[PDB]
Amino acid sequence: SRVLLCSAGHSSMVVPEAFHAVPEGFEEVHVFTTDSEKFNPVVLNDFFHSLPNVRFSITKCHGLADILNERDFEFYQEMLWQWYLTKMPDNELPYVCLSGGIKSMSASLQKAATLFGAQSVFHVLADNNPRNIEEMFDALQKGQIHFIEMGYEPGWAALRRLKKILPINEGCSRDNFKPLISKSIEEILSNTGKSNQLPFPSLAILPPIAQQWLQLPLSANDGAWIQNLPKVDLHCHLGGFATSGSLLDQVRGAASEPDLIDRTFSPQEIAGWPRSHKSISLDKYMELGNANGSKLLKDKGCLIRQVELLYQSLVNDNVAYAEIRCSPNNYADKNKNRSAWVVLQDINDTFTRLITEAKQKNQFYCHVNLLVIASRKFSGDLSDISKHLALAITAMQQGEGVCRIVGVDLAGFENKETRASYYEHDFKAVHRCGLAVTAHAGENDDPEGIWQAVYSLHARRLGHALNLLEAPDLMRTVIERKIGVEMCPYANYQIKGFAPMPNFSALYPLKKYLEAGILVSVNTDNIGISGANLSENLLILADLCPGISRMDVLTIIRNSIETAFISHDFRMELLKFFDRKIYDVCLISIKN
Amino acid sequence: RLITEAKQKNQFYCHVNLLVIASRKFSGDLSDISKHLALAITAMQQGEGVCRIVGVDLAGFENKETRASYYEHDFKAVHRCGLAVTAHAGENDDPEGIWQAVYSLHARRLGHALNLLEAP
Amino acid sequence: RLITEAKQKNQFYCHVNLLVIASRKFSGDLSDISKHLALAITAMQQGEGVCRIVGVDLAGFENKETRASYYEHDFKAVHRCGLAVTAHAGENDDPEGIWQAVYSLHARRLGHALNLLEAPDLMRTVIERKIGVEMCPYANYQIKGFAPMPNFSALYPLKKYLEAGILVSVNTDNIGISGANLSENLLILADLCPGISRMDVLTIIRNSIETAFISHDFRMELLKFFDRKIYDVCLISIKN
Numbered sequence: 001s002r003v004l005l006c007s008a009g010h011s012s013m014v015v016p017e018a019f020h021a022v023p024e025g026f027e028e029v030h031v032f033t034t035d036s037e038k039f040n041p042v043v044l045n046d047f048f049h050s051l052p053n054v055r056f057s058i059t060k061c062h063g064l065a066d067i068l069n070e071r072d073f074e075f076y077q078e079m080l081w082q083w084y085l086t087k088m089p090d091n092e093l094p095y096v097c098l099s100g101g102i103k104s105m106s107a108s109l110q111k112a113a114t115l116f117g118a119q120s121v122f123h124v125l126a127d128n129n130p131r132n133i134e135e136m137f138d139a140l141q142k143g144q145i146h147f148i149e150m151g152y153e154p155g156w157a158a159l160r161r162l163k164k165i166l167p168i169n170e171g172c173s174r175d176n177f178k179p180l181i182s183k184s185i186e187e188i189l190s191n192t193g194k195s196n197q198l199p200f201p202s203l204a205i206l207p208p209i210a211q212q213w214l215q216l217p218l219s220a221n222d223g224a225w226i227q228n229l230p231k232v233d234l235h236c237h238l239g240g241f242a243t244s245g246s247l248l249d250q251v252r253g254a255a256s257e258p259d260l261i262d263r264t265f266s267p268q269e270i271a272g273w274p275r276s277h278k279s280i281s282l283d284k285y286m287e288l289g290n291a292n293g294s295k296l297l298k299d300k301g302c303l304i305r306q307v308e309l310l311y312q313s314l315v316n317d318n319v320a321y322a323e324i325r326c327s328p329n330n331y332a333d334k335n336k337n338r339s340a341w342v343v344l345q346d347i348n349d350t351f352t353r354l355i356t357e358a359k360q361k362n363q364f365y366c367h368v369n370l371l372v373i374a375s376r377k378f379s380g381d382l383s384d385i386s387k388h389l390a391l392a393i394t395a396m397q398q399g400e401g402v403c404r405i406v407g408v409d410l411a412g413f414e415n416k417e418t419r420a421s422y423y424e425h426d427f428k429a430v431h432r433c434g435l436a437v438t439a440h441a442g443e444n445d446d447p448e449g450i451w452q453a454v455y456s457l458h459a460r461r462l463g464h465a466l467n468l469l470e471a472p473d474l475m476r477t478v479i480e481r482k483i484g485v486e487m488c489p490y491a492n493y494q495i496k497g498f499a500p501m502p503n504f505s506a507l508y509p510l511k512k513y514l515e516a517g518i519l520v521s522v523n524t525d526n527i528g529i530s531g532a533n534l535s536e537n538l539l540i541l542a543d544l545c546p547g548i549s550r551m552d553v554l555t556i557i558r559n560s561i562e563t564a565f566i567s568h569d570f571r572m573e574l575l576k577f578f579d580r581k582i583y584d585v586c587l588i589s590i591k592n
Numbered sequence: 593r594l595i596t597e598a599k600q601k602n603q604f605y606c607h608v609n610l611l612v613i614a615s616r617k618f619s620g621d622l623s624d625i626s627k628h629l630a631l632a633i634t635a636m637q638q639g640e641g642v643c644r645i646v647g648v649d650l651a652g653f654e655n656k657e658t659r660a661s662y663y664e665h666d667f668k669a670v671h672r673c674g675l676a677v678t679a680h681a682g683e684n685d686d687p688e689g690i691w692q693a694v695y696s697l698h699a700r701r702l703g704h705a706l707n708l709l710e711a712p
Numbered sequence: 713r714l715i716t717e718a719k720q721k722n723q724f725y726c727h728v729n730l731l732v733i734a735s736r737k738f739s740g741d742l743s744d745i746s747k748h749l750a751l752a753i754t755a756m757q758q759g760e761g762v763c764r765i766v767g768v769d770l771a772g773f774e775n776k777e778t779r780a781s782y783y784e785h786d787f788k789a790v791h792r793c794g795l796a797v798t799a800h801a802g803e804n805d806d807p808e809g810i811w812q813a814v815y816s817l818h819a820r821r822l823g824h825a826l827n828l829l830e831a832p833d834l835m836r837t838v839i840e841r842k843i844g845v846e847m848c849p850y851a852n853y854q855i856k857g858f859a860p861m862p863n864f865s866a867l868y869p870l871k872k873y874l875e876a877g878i879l880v881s882v883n884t885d886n887i888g889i890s891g892a893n894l895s896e897n898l899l900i901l902a903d904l905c906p907g908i909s910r911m912d913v914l915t916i917i918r919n920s921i922e923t924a925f926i927s928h929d930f931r932m933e934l935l936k937f938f939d940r941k942i943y944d945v946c947l948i949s950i951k952n
């Protein structure tokens with residue numbers, strides 16, 4: 001590339017000196033000059049006609065002269081920024097000399113160089129101020145000409161996508177302005193520890209403008225940024241991914257024995273999905289996934305296809321770590337010697353084979369761990385819970401393998417015979433073994449139930465639990481004990497109903513939870529019935545919790561990493577990789 | 593495989609079932625008992641097979657420190673799952689320990705236990 | 713009063729918090745523990761003041777007869793009120809007692825407990841639960857003895873604990889009898905644990921900040937300050 005940019009005013013001999021600044025000559029030269037007639041293009045034309053190989057051009061701003069007015073200044077700034085964007089080389093930053101012109105366009109060009117990158121911002125000066133070509137030729141021969149250099153300037157590497165979004169606009173007027181950077185500059189402080197919620201310390205290396213744009217409120221137009229961000233999912237049920245659509249159809253087709261499957265059953269469609277305008281009961285939500293689940297994944301082929309499709313969706317959503325809950329007893333039948341253990345073994349083997357295959361090809365891969373969900377309902381008998389706990393404890397002892405059981409889950413419970421306050425004797429074994437414990441303590445459960453889950457079971461993560469506001473002691477214990485909280489904005493938004501739900505005034509407490517310091521994480525619950533992956537699940541927070549910031553999203557990701565049931569070495573490696581990827585994407589996503 | 597092969601030839605064989613051993617160490621890793629119990633339970637889900645897990649064994653030294661009066665909570669699950677419990681209490685068989693094994697543990701078999709004449 | 717008068721003149725000050733030691737006597741008045749607990753709870757209702765009690769300490773002899781396997785009923789109330797619990801199980805600390813302190817007592821930070829190397833499951837549980845361990849290098853070096861102590865080849869487990877990922881803090885226990893302040897306690901790691909790096913000292917500071925019994929907003933304010941001060945002192949030391 002090696003493109004030089006200069007601003008020419010009354011003086012015209014600065015351009016040859018800027019050309020001679022490099023010790024091997026330039027390759028392309030473009031000069032932006034004002035519409036004033038003082039500038040003489042004849043000298044530049046005759047100087048650059050001696051070297052046809054280099055490229056020369058001249059741009060004049062129509063309707064501007066001497067830039068003595070606020071409207072004139074803003075129009076000149078906009079036109080100069082557009083010209084700078086147009087002549088950016090595709091890969092290499094361009095050199096820029098701003099000696100020519102009055103302090104106005106000089107300062108504007110320096111600001112543009114800071115904003116859009118500049119391989120070398122340099123000045124040219126001489127003792128006698130030469131005018132003719134012979135004068136500065138003799139000056140450079142003697143060495144009088146000095147090339148002031150203030151150092152390389154990386155600029156902010158992602159601002160050129162504006163060029164892809166802003167047309168050439170060769171013929172335009174004063175209306176066509178792009179104050180998309182001045183808005184953040186005004187919004188610096190126009191709104192305590194928010195600077196210190198800085199996760200992934202390499203964000204400190206980021207440009208100041210990028211650090212600022214991180215602090216601006218999240219907007220619905222950041223779908224690309226959210227999708228490109230590596231994410232962590234901790235609440236993603238396996239049985240609710242291929243509920244309906246093409247994925248369910250191909251899962252059904254890939255069954256080993258499709259004769260026994262029930263393809264006639266279809267789930268009723270709720271109008272307005274996924275942003276339904278009416279509240280949905282938990283029982284109806286569970287029934288909505290009856291197309292998939294226990295009744296379908298009994299055969300090996302359907303289960304393997306469903307797991308492969310779920311992993312494909314996970315790696316397509318840039319999720320770099322996910323914990324999937326599976327219930328082996330739902331997919332186990334003794335007719336074909338398919339026990340719960342063999343079902344869990346098949347799921348684990350498929351996940352580890354997919355992970356190893358993806359990693360061998362040196363592509364982006366999603367490390368996946370499994371939670372054995374121990375739903376304590378059954379037909380009123382607790383042998384199911386003991387069987388699930390024993391299965392998880394034995395599944396830990398596999399040891400070798402990438403994907404492994406990390407913890408258990410408790411769900412499918414209401415109260416009394418199902419309350420968690422009467423199982424700690426069983427849970428002594430699972431705690432001694434080393435498994436983690438996660439609770440589904442939502443469904444408007446009493447705060448005493450949450451207390452029992454936190455203390456009696458020593459649970460490390462609580463599902464949903466949106467009623468923490470009504471119990472200040474519960475919030476104090478949760479924050480002080482560093483107990484993570486997982487919520488699904490789409491699932492809890494449809495099931496319960498939060499603003500902007502019509503005829504609903506309750507607000508999502510995610511912003512308040514983040515302000516209070518709860519280790520809150522964002523998840524997907526069931527991908528299929530909810531019909532929204534992690535990307536839109538995070539994007540909806542711009543409406544569910546207005547006023548949230550991108551820095552809060554990165555804090556969400558950091559909390560998800562911190563509260564995951566992983567070994568310390570793996571957690572450190574994951575944190576390092578996540579920080580590097582986040583820095584890279586943020587450095588190449590402020591372009592738009 | 594051995595049992596089926598013997599049955600195919602239509603001769604005398606020996607049907608065999610397996611009891612896991614809940615060995616006691618108290619030299620660290622006290623969760624071993626639980627692990628063993630869990631193992632037994634999940635093996636019951638094999639379902640098929642002429643040979644199958646039929647219960648657990650309470651092997652190990654059975655002095656006062658290692659009595660069966662502390663582990664009813666762990667054994668509630670193994671009793672719920674249908675396994676039979678055998679107590680390997682041999683020497684230093686205090687009558688209180690055997691009573692606890694019989695009643696608290698709901699054991700259906702006692703190993704050795706040659707001191708029953710002392711406690712009518 | 714001291715903290716307020718130090719803040720008024722706008723200088724460096726040391727924010728402090730209180731811990732009520734619920735030690736064990738066994739020479740009578742066995743209710744003392746309960747009394748201490750009650751006292752702590754009542755004093756939490758002070759509300760105001762930059763200095764307030766944030767937890768209790770389970771000091772005293774740590775034999776089996778007075779282990780943490782009897783006091784769950786008493787400690788349910790202190791857990792409910794909102795006081796953190798620190799276990800002083802460092803002497804004759806059987807792994808069962810430490811496990812009971814972690815789970816039955818819901819201890820948020822252990823005291824000493826230098827024998828975690830032998831028990832892998834206990835160390836794994838401590839690492840996973842993110843519970844801190846406070847070790848004073850000078851006190852443990854004088855009492856237990858570690859290299860380069862003559863006729864003592866035992867290695868201090870601080871470096872291994874840090875490598876494993878435990879949240880380990882360095883303290884003084886008693887400034888008087890030990891005769892060494894916090895700076896000397898950190899300095900002694902040069903020969904107590906060979907190979908420890910300065911970044912590991914910063915890790916120790918971060919762990920001590922994280923495991924401290926403080927409110928979240930105060931914790932983040934402290935973390936921001938600490939970031940500024942550490943940056944300043946590191947820059948000054950490197951430039952000079």
Ligand SMILES: Nc1ncnc2c1ncn2[C@@H]1O[C@H](COP(=O)(O)OP(=O)(O)OP(=O)(O)O)[C@@H](O)[C@H]1O
Pocket residue numbers: 602603604605606607
């Ligand atoms: N599950 C079993 N366990 C032990 N013995 C069995 C079992 N099933 C069958 N048997 C016995 O094995 C024997 C097979 O041998 P056989 O058919 O010649 O009968 P037999 O007249 O008793 O002569 P033999 O001495 O060979 O047993 C049968 O007698 C049968 O009663």
Ligand SMILES: Nc1ncnc2c1ncn2[C@@H]1O[C@H](COP(=O)(O)OP(=O)(O)OP(=O)(O)O)[C@@H](O)[C@H]1O
Pocket residue numbers: 722723724725726727937940944
């Ligand atoms: N509770 C505290 N205890 C100790 N230091 C504190 C405390 N709170 C704030 N500080 C820090 O004390 C310093 C007050 O002095 P100042 O505002 O001049 O900052 P400074 O540039 O570091 O200069 P100085 O040497 O005076 O600290 C602040 O940096 C502040 O972050």
Ligand SMILES: [Mg+2]
Pocket residue numbers: 235237525526
């Ligand atoms: Mg769920």
Ligand SMILES: [Mg+2]
Pocket residue numbers: 885
């Ligand atoms: Mg002490």
